[PDB]
């Protein structure tokens, strides 16, 4: 499924994302755009070391996820992957939820400090009624 732009944000907002840990709804809604321009089927496929990224957030299956076939990786969220490519985006939320309980938090997210760290991000959520 493609998301709406505040479609996404009302869900987000329900499922308990703003200040998570931190974070502001709109932090998430520009990791969100970002990495897969809010479609929860993305997959990426990383040759460079066998992992491949997943759904709305691309959460890598090195560390987060089960897909089986990447080396020496571990599923911290206790998921398979193919959870986080579902149009219900509830468990694809618990799981960026566990992301950002590490130390780096949203920063986890290499995109996020390209295109979001120090930006105004306002412009996300105006007019969502969040
Ligand atoms: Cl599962
Ligand atoms: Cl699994
Ligand atoms: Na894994």
Redesign the pocket.
Known sequence: KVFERCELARTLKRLGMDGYRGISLANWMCLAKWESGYNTRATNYNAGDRSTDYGIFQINSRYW??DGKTPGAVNAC???C??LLQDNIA?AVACAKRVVRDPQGIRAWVAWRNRCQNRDVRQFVQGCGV
């Open positions: 996820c089960n206790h998921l398979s193919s959870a468990d």
